[PDB]
Amino acid sequence: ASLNWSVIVPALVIVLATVVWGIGFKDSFTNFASSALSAVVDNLGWAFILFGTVFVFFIVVIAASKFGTIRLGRIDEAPEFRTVSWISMMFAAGMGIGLMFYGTTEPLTFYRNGVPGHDEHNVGVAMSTTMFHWTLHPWAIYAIVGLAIAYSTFRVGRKQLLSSAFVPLIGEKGAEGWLGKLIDILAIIATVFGTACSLGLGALQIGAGLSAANIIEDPSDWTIVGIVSVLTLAFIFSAISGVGKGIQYLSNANMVLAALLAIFVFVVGPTVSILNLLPGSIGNYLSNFFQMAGRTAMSADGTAGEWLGSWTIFYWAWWISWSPFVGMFLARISRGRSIREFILGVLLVPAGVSTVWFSIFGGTAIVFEQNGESIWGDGAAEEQLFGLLHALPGGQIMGIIAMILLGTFFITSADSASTVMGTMSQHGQLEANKWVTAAWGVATAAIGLTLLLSGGDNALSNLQNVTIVAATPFLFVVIGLMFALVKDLSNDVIYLEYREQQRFNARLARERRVHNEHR
Amino acid sequence: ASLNWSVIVPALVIVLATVVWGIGFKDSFTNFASSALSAVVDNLGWAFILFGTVFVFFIVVIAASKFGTIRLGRIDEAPEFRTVSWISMMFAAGMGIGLMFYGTTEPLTFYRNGVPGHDEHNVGVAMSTTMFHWTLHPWAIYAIVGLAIAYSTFRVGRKQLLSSAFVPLIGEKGAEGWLGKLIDILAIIATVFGTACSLGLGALQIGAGLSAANIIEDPSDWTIVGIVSVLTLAFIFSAISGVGKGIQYLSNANMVLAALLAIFVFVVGPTVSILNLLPGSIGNYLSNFFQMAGRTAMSADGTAGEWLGSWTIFYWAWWISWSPFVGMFLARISRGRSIREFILGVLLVPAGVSTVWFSIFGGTAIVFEQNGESIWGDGAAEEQLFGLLHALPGGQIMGIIAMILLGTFFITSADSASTVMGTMSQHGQLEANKWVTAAWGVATAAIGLTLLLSGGDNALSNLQNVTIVAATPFLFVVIGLMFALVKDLSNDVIYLEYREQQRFNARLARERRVHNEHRKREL
Amino acid sequence: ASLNWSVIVPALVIVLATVVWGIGFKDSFTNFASSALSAVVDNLGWAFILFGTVFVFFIVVIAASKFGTIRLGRIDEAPEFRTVSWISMMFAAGMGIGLMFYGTTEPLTFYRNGVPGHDEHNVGVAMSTTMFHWTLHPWAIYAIVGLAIAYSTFRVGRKQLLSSAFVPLIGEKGAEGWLGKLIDILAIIATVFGTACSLGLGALQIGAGLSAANIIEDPSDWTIVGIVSVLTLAFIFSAISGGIQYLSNANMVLAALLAIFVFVVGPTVSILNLLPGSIGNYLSNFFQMAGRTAMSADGTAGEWLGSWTIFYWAWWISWSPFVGMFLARISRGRSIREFILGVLLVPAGVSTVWFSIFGGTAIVFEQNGESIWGDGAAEEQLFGLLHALPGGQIMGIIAMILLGTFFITSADSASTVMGTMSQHGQLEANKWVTAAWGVATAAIGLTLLLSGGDNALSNLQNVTIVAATPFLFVVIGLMFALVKDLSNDVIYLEYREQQRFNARLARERRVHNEHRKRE
Ligand SMILES: CCCCCCCCCCCCCCCCCC(=O)O[C@@H](COC(=O)CCCCCCCCCCCCCCC)COP(=O)(O)OC[C@H](O)CO
Numbered sequence A: 001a002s003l004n005w006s007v008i009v010p011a012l013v014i015v016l017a018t019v020v021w022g023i024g025f026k027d028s029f030t031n032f033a034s035s036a037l038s039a040v041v042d043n044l045g046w047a048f049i050l051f052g053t054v055f056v057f058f059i060v061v062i063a064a065s066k067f068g069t070i071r072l073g074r075i076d077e078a079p080e081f082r083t084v085s086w087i088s089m090m091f092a093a094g095m096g097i098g099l100m101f102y103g104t105t106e107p108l109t110f111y112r113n114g115v116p117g118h119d120e121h122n123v124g125v126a127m128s129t130t131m132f133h134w135t136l137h138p139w140a141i142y143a144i145v146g147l148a149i150a151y152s153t154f155r156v157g158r159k160q161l162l163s164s165a166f167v168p169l170i171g172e173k174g175a176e177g178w179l180g181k182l183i184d185i186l187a188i189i190a191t192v193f194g195t196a197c198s199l200g201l202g203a204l205q206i207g208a209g210l211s212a213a214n215i216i217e218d219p220s221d222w223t224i225v226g227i228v229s230v231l232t233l234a235f236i237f238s239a240i241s242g243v244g245k246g247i248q249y250l251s252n253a254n255m256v257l258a259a260l261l262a263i264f265v266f267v268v269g270p271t272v273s274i275l276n277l278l279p280g281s282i283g284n285y286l287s288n289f290f291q292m293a294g295r296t297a298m299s300a301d302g303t304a305g306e307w308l309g310s311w312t313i314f315y316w317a318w319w320i321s322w323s324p325f326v327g328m329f330l331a332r333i334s335r336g337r338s339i340r341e342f343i344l345g346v347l348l349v350p351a352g353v354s355t356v357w358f359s360i361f362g363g364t365a366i367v368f369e370q371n372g373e374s375i376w377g378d379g380a381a382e383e384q385l386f387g388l389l390h391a392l393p394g395g396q397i398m399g400i401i402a403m404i405l406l407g408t409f410f411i412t413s414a415d416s417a418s419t420v421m422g423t424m425s426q427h428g429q430l431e432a433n434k435w436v437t438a439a440w441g442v443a444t445a446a447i448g449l450t451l452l453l454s455g456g457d458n459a460l461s462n463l464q465n466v467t468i469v470a471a472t473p474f475l476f477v478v479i480g481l482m483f484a485l486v487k488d489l490s491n492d493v494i495y496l497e498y499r500e501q502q503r504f505n506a507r508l509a510r511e512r513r514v515h516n517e518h519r
Numbered sequence B: 001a002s003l004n005w006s007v008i009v010p011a012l013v014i015v016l017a018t019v020v021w022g023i024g025f026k027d028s029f030t031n032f033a034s035s036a037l038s039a040v041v042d043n044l045g046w047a048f049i050l051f052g053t054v055f056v057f058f059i060v061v062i063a064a065s066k067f068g069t070i071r072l073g074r075i076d077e078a079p080e081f082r083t084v085s086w087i088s089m090m091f092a093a094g095m096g097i098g099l100m101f102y103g104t105t106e107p108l109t110f111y112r113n114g115v116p117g118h119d120e121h122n123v124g125v126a127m128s129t130t131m132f133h134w135t136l137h138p139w140a141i142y143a144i145v146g147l148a149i150a151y152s153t154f155r156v157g158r159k160q161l162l163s164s165a166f167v168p169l170i171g172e173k174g175a176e177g178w179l180g181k182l183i184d185i186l187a188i189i190a191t192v193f194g195t196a197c198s199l200g201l202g203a204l205q206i207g208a209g210l211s212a213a214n215i216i217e218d219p220s221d222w223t224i225v226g227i228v229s230v231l232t233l234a235f236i237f238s239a240i241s242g243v244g245k246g247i248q249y250l251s252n253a254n255m256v257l258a259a260l261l262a263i264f265v266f267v268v269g270p271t272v273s274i275l276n277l278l279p280g281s282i283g284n285y286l287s288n289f290f291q292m293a294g295r296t297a298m299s300a301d302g303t304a305g306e307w308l309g310s311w312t313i314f315y316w317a318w319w320i321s322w323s324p325f326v327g328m329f330l331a332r333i334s335r336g337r338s339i340r341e342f343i344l345g346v347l348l349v350p351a352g353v354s355t356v357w358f359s360i361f362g363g364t365a366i367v368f369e370q371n372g373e374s375i376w377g378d379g380a381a382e383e384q385l386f387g388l389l390h391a392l393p394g395g396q397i398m399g400i401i402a403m404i405l406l407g408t409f410f411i412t413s414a415d416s417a418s419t420v421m422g423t424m425s426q427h428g429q430l431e432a433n434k435w436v437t438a439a440w441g442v443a444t445a446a447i448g449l450t451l452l453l454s455g456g457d458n459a460l461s462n463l464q465n466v467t468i469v470a471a472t473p474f475l476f477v478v479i480g481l482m483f484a485l486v487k488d489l490s491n492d493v494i495y496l497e498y499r500e501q502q503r504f505n506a507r508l509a510r511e512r513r514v515h516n517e518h519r520k521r522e523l
Numbered sequence C: 001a002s003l004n005w006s007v008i009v010p011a012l013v014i015v016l017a018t019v020v021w022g023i024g025f026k027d028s029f030t031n032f033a034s035s036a037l038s039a040v041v042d043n044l045g046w047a048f049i050l051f052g053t054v055f056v057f058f059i060v061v062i063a064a065s066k067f068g069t070i071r072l073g074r075i076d077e078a079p080e081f082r083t084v085s086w087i088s089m090m091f092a093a094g095m096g097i098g099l100m101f102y103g104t105t106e107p108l109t110f111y112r113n114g115v116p117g118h119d120e121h122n123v124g125v126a127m128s129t130t131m132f133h134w135t136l137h138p139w140a141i142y143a144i145v146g147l148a149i150a151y152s153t154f155r156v157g158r159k160q161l162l163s164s165a166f167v168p169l170i171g172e173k174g175a176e177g178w179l180g181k182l183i184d185i186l187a188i189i190a191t192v193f194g195t196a197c198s199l200g201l202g203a204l205q206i207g208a209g210l211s212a213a214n215i216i217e218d219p220s221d222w223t224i225v226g227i228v229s230v231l232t233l234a235f236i237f238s239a240i241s242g243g244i245q246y247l248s249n250a251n252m253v254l255a256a257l258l259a260i261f262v263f264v265v266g267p268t269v270s271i272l273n274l275l276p277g278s279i280g281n282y283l284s285n286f287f288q289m290a291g292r293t294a295m296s297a298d299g300t301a302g303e304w305l306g307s308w309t310i311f312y313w314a315w316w317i318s319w320s321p322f323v324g325m326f327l328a329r330i331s332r333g334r335s336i337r338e339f340i341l342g343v344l345l346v347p348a349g350v351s352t353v354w355f356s357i358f359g360g361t362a363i364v365f366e367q368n369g370e371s372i373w374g375d376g377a378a379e380e381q382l383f384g385l386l387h388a389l390p391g392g393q394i395m396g397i398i399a400m401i402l403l404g405t406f407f408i409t410s411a412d413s414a415s416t417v418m419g420t421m422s423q424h425g426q427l428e429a430n431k432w433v434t435a436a437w438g439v440a441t442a443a444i445g446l447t448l449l450l451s452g453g454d455n456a457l458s459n460l461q462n463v464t465i466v467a468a469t470p471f472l473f474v475v476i477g478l479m480f481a482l483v484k485d486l487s488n489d490v491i492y493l494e495y496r497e498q499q500r501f502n503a504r505l506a507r508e509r510r511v512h513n514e515h516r517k518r519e
């Protein structure tokens, strides 16, 4: 119930230093972020690439290897959220602004420029390589972190923290030791920079749309603060205000506005061409899955390092930053699901929705390029979605609807992050003081502004460089959550009696052999 | 039993509407079919491609899930057919003219012309594409349709109708009024138009068999009528008459005769080159399985649209239209057989026989092409097999036995279609009227003839256009069968007791949560 | 206790005839080997390739199947060796000089020359095709043979022979009769020529290692005779006097030191960029490489396959008879599923990391420009690589000591096993019977090395393919024999007995119903 000042103070100091450094000295901060990315991507990029696909293997195995039957709670327990409602709150908190910002930019960018090891103007690899970054590899990080927290919190009954998930690996003395503190600090620093990156990427696109919709003429440096201040003041209140409906209501407004914007483009846009990419993109994704997972800085004659540092290694570092707080939320909602249900509900359902979104939006953008109409414009990634919407008839009203979607796809996740950061500040208490939950909401905004204003002309690169550095320390925490998780699952109360017999029989068999050899 | 006159008449009107429209207005029928094919392929082409692979995935998780152990019948039941004789009737009924007609022409056509997104003269792609069209995607449609009927008929004791398999979705009342009747005429129309495509294709190859054997000099239009007339008598006599050991003897004769012609080509032909292709075709098939499963009209920079309508979408429509009556037959001969045992038996064993078949005949044809001696000839698909056989020693005598095998590969499947069609008009009576079984056999021959005389030179094109159109309505019945199947399986007696406790506990937990939220909500 | 002279004599005649033939008439022996090699590769090339992949499929399906839980021994038994000590002795005994000889020659050869159907200078396929030959296809033959012997010996109580694992097919009378003596003769000839092929290659690399290290001025045919004789006594001494566990652990520690040396002082980061780039490519092309016959590349693959793929498959099949009975001996009380995974995966993991450190470090040198190819002799690639790295003059000698233990641990277990197939499956075989087979292996090793002249590699390869062809069909027949007696387990007869009775009634009812209705 205390404030665990051994976790708040180290996390505040790093956050405050970034705000002072980024805002105070823009030139120095930008150079360090560029230098830090090169060292991280060069000497550590293999870790993201190698372990990014180990998570997918590890999770699928855990969902079939004798543990899919265990239940995240007590035996005979039942889920407190109906399946349809349960799925809605996980994709709303799981996804922020990644289907809006990159829904059109990414599949279109790979169509024009191409991907390393391939040619340009290829719709098979433009779409398949987009599904690679948004279907299984990213959502397998949430399952691993969410499952480790869900099991320890419910089956074993420990505090709601990320250190407690490591009790098997570092014992109970280490959960209160220097390691327990460090694992918890890295979960807040990752979350603050993980959300601040998506706040900065959503403030750019909301401001970009206003120029399109002409509510405003063009974004300015003060406009970004205005958008961030409104977005910050929205999720900060929605998290810590009893008035209004909870996250289960907002999580349902997301899936309604998102389906409104997807159905509009699907119907108005090239329906038949969109429907043809759905099998072609899934078929190309499954045949190229391992070929794409084996792409490193050594691929394409060693020239793919620059591409990976902006597309793959950024996404993997981005999703890992959101895992510490999207794992804790996913744990809260399950409370009764079996390991198989949790794994297959997180891996397959969010992956199916992301497949349809990118074919409706990525397919429309690519189809426009083939036809002759090009929504690329000046190339800015923020302006591409609204250039597509405005091309379609009736897009003026939908351009406005896309803003509410942009704002409401970050509020659902940002508010959950604050309430999840608040519980780490205390000793895993579900109820968090509204002041610490509001204090962390401001921290993401202060970082979100710092990464945007400091970036200047190129604010995307600065927002992406800092995320990769802030997520590298927590990449290893996720790797060590695979070993901690298996130790917990093996030492289950429904396996202790069976494991004791094997320990006894194994000891005797060794004793018989050593004595038998002498005789 | 009482004839289902509410299904015979609406289905018979479609059949007779096409016959008069085809013989009398050949000029206007071909135009409509070609225009209909364009409308279907352009708009619903993705459906065949997208859901042709969901069937493979759906019937693999079903076999691998907890439903695999279920037994198609009571618990403690045991199959009534020797597992060897179960396969023989499974393959004999499930396959007809296909292997004989496209055994040589498909692998050779892809070797010369190539496939979209690939170069010509590529043996790996040529062989790994004909295995795609004939191994797992086609036989996964039979398993889904056959399993839905087998489960409802035996495990749940409903009537043997395609409507009854939808009771989980539309209910016992929906399955009777108007949706059930629609699903029961779309199944008869698909069966009539799916078996008429095989009859037309078989008559074309039989006519070429007599030209190559020189028994007939020139196949005119009055000999095709002679061939179809003999064939339609063959499977009407077998279907209705109680003598002759209709099945388990003519189905066992098909393996004996099918293997005799495969062994002849294997040993007389390039045996070592055939065996070198066998591991290369399977390896290439599994490597490119998902590249071919995602080949839509957007492939080859938009050039694949015309290719798919001739090979991929035609096959998926050809197999979709045969699944109403193959699935119904596979249910009867698979009583007491578990779900996993049923799915693996259908998916794997028939897929293995096809793989060996196309290596011996596709490999021999491709090997000849490389050497310099080409059996392509003029390029008619109906004359390739006999061009291959006559290029080997002893082919003259062995070309006559290919025609007999060609006929017997239709009779074993056409007689089971007429019998199943009669059952669909007897409210599911296993033994239907002889004059309803025979009437439906004559209907199949009438349409098969109408699509040959109407086409003229492009007889094959007219047969493929109509099959795709007739099998489009049933594409959605198969999509719906895989939604009513999981509900049927889920609501099983063995799982019913456990489900009730889980629902009961879930309601309490949900109610407990909402109350706690209210208690915290107030203050 | 008897020596089964009716199996020893036929084995000796084939072994002795080869020694006289090769030494007596080198020209005739070399000409016959080339003629026989072409005859087998053309006619039976598909058999090695077609059934090479069926072994991988067959073993995974058996571990997946219900049989996976059957325990090799009595119900509720426990293993005699710790999992780490059991793993260490399976790899040391199952791997001879293959990793040392081809650690740098194979991945580097494919980078320069390419592979059938692919362009040259491709690091992706150089490493992906290198792991094809050393990860799953090879180690799956060991599990098929090791499992058939382990199951029949322990869970059925039959004598520890290769013929005793065939009684489900040939019957008890057949195994005692003639077919089961030819299976024992072929099981001896294959292991004599397989172990002599690796002894020949080991002597070439040690002979080249001495010349490179300046210990011996030049490599002379009379110098190699000294190496083989010295190597002959080491493994004969270990299998006779009063061991395996100690030397198998000295293998792993000493080998891991050599791998750590190259890893640390080589391009560490570039090595790690290939760890996921080779696993991704391996899984991508697994079925493209698994379906590579002589028909691939339009007849150009026939000459390549006989040198790389069909050679390895015949080389690993040669070692299966005696690695099968060694794997069975130490795997008492392990479940079938635990046996398959402990053999297929862990040795594949060590091989995958071995070639990345050594194949990667040799390919980067090619890319940089400093090529270690030199003259191009396969036996000099390793010592070119080590000398390039700093400190490779002391680590270039430990490679030769590591070439001794690698062969000695496997050769020590070959003689012990070869002396058991002659004494009616008696574990404690006569000391002189092991010695007799120990020097018969050395005589064959020299015969192929001397008769080969300048091209000693081709003579060793052409004769192991012919010697391992008869035993290709014994492994193909072990899949059927293994399935026959796995089904007929004590924990399935009651279930199988009831099912057959019910099925017979169902057939009887149908036949009676048919008569009633047919009338
Ligand atoms: C050169 C590269 C070649 C290799 C390519 C990569 C291969 C990766 C393979 C990874 C194997 C993982 C080993 C664990 C297998 C999982 C399945 C399993 O063990 O299931 C058993 C139960 O599970 C266990 O007891 C052990 C499971 C492992 C514990 C979890 C550890 C994490 C493993 C994650 C996978 C590895 C991820 C790393 C990357 C592959 C038995 O299952 P069952 O009894 O429920 O079903 C069979 C039924 O009875 C008969 O039909």
Ligand SMILES: CCCCCCCCCCCCCCCCCC(=O)O[C@@H](COC(=O)CCCCCCCCCCCCCCC)COP(=O)(O)OC[C@H](O)CO
Pocket (backbone or CB within 6 Å): A135, A136, A278, A279, A280, A281, A282, A283, A284, A286, A344, A347, A348, A349, A351, A352, A355, B049, B050, B051, B053, B054, B057, B058, B061, B062, B065, B293, B294, B486, B490
């Ligand atoms: C996420 C998809 C987007 C693409 C990205 C991922 C790449 C594709 C991966 C393909 C995964 C498909 C298979 C995953 C489904 C797992 C199903 C499973 O594990 O078990 C269930 C499966 O059982 C089924 O119901 C059938 C599932 C059908 C799955 C078919 C998958 C089709 C996907 C193919 C796409 C087509 C692509 C076109 C060609 C490119 C059991 O549930 P149940 O509803 O039967 O009830 C169980 C129990 O009673 C509880 O009450």
Ligand SMILES: CCCCCCCCCCCCCCCCCC(=O)O[C@@H](COC(=O)CCCCCCCCCCCCCCC)COP(=O)(O)OC[C@H](O)CO
Pocket (backbone or CB within 6 Å): B131, B135, B136, B282, B283, B285, B286, B338, B340, B341, B344, B348, B351, B352, B355, C053, C054, C057, C058, C059, C061, C062, C064, C065, C066, C067, C290, C483
């Ligand atoms: C690349 C070339 C590969 C070619 C062939 C490889 C496959 C052959 C090896 C696998 C078969 C060995 C069978 C070993 C005995 C296990 C039998 C067994 O116990 O059944 C279990 C394991 O058996 C299997 O699942 C068999 C799987 C066969 C795998 C076939 C793979 C080859 C096909 C690949 C796809 C390509 C298709 C052909 C090309 C068109 C599963 O069922 P269950 O025992 O749990 O319950 C029984 C129930 O009644 C069901 O019968």
Ligand code: NA
Pocket (backbone or CB within 6 Å): A091, A092, A093, A094, A095, A096, A097, A408, A409, A410, A411, A412, A413, A414
């Ligand atoms: Na959200």
Ligand code: NA
Pocket (backbone or CB within 6 Å): B091, B092, B093, B094, B095, B096, B097, B408, B409, B410, B411, B412, B413, B414
């Ligand atoms: Na047939």
